[PDB]
Homo-oligomer: A and B are copies of this chain.
Amino acid sequence: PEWYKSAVFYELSVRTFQDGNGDGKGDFPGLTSRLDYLKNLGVDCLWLLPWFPSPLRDDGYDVADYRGIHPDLGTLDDFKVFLREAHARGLWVIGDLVTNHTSSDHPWFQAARRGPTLNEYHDYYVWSNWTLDEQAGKYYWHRFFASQPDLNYDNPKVVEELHGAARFWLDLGLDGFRVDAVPYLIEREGTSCENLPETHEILKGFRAMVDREYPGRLLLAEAFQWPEEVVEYFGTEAEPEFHMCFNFPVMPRLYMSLKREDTSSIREIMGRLPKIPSFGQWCIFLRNHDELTLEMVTDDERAFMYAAYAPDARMKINVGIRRRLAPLLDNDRRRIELLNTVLLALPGSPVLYYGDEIGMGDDLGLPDRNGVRTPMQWNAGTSGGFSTAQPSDCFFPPIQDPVYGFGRVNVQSQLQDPSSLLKWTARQLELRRAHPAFAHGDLTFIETGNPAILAFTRQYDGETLLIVSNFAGNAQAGLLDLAPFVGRAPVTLSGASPLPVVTGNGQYPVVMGKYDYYWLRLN
């Protein structure tokens, strides 16, 4: 019933998507001009990166106004037109609500740093991972960066200031937030300072507030933890909290399984997913604005990944690999389609990262995770059509290498190419939309004779989908245990071509080509 359960999401950064005014930086007007593209792509909801005023010491997650638009993205009017036009086209939109902290440049903090009195803004933050404030002559607490002062959530004027910020955007029409850094909200003495029941209480209320005043809207938990730990942040039926949390550990295991030609680890994570509230939905993805993280893997698995996908030391950062999906898969369209299909056929709402629909590469010449944040590539024009501004003058430079450059990889080409990745992606999303079991159906892995072949069913409302996916780079054989479905014919979702009916014991033999995916219905 709820929209976010069946939504395909699409993550972009306004600053990097389309420059509307020639200054080299993406902006809302420019984004507005590309809404038809996003519409026709088949995406349902745009998740925009932080659009708020900031000195950008932590990519604008250090917020210095919660009710503003960063000046070089346009104005609050631009934002309103963007949302009107987005909605006119059947698109939901969400943003990033940074709950735990602000930038040091927030008025609140500039007021707070002036002793206890001259001052109601002193007790918004936590005073005496502590830094000496020159002005106030005290230490302040910061969970994350010295320039990111953690908020005092024990002061309930702050809990209102949060609720207020949320309303500001929800009033304007915004369909949800991805809610950041929520585990670190309250802090006790001699304890974890994460996942504390008091912090959960605030979220339960925050939820119950939007449930009441703004039904339909979406709260999505950015909270980097295993499923078995974030289930907490869904709350309960009686006390709901977040509608959606991410399922992180699938992600690296898709890549790992491709290179191991062994899909065991996918089953291990997916099949052992905990139960969730009836209103809840998992959120999954292949790539995003950060590196491909390897935190939720063994050390030996992490070492395998590095050998497999980061041959160049430059490719490593933090605890992961800072490369785009296409370069990771050696620009192999077969592997690109494969993982995308598997992503789309698993339970959860998938998030697609801007540019991956057309096969974008990365720029390791750029510091610190910026190589996967280059400008979108629209045509073979001057800066990939991203700006009339020359490449040197764009926020990040548009990619021009012989393989992934905008002269070869761009939206216009793939709009005109009958067999482009772009059009493929759009069709596949359409296929997914035509079958509710993808979004709401259950998940049952099935026996293949072969770890390289992953097979599973998705069941809902008397529809049964059979998804078979070869993770090997050559022909594989399987014996699918389809005993439950004897007397049924697996039929091709694309084109309704029927396969042999399951008979006898229902051990169904198959061969598959390299990286093939079979999207089948059972009836």
Contact = CB atoms under 8 A, between A and B. Distances in A.
A407 B380 contact: yes
A512 B513 contact: yes
Contact of A402 (B412, B476, B511): B412
A499 interface: yes
A517 B513 contact: yes
Q: Which of A472, A494, A495 has the most chain B CB atoms closer than 10 A to its own CB?
A: A495
Interface in A318-347: 330-333
A298 interface: no
A413 interface: yes
B333 A419 contact: yes
Interface string A306-324: 0000000000000000000
A475 B511 contact: no
A412 B513 CA distance: 29
A513 B518 contact: yes
Given A477-B499, A497-B476, A419 B517 contact: no
Number of identical protomers:
2
Nearest to A411: B402
Contacts of A405: 380
A500 B517 contact: no
Interface residues of A, number: 41
Contacts of A495: 472-474
A402 B416 contact: yes
Contacts of A494: 473-474
A497 B512 contact: no
A516 interface: yes
A408 interface: yes
Given A379-B402, A497-B472, A513-B512, A413 B419 contact: no
A416 B412 CA distance: 23
A156 B511 CA distance: 64
Contacts of A412: 402
Nearest to A480: B511
A380 B400 CA distance: 11
Contacts of A416: 401-403
B331 A333 contact: no
A265 interface: no
A509 interface: yes
A475 B498 CA distance: 9
Nearest to A495: B474
Interface in A407-453: 407-408, 410, 412-413, 416-420
Interface in A464-523: 472-477, 492, 494-495, 497, 499-500, 509-513, 516-518, 520
A331 B419 contact: yes
A518 B477 CA distance: 12
5 closest residue pairs by CB, A with B: A513-B516, A332-B419, A330-B418, A474-B495, A407-B407
Given A330-B419, A333-B333, A401-B416, 6 more contacts: A332-B418, A332-B419, A402-B413, A474-B492, A477-B499, A516-B516
30 contacts: A330-B418, A330-B419, A331-B419, A333-B419, A380-B407, A380-B408, A402-B410, A402-B413, A402-B416, A407-B408, A408-B408, A408-B413, A473-B494, A473-B495, A474-B492, A474-B495, A475-B492, A475-B497, A475-B499, A475-B520, A499-B511, A509-B509, A510-B510, A510-B511, A511-B511, A511-B518, A512-B513, A513-B516, A513-B517, A513-B518
Interface of A: 330-333, 379-380, 401-403, 405, 407-408, 410, 412-413, 416-420, 472-477, 492, 494-495, 497, 499-500, 509-513, 516-518, 520
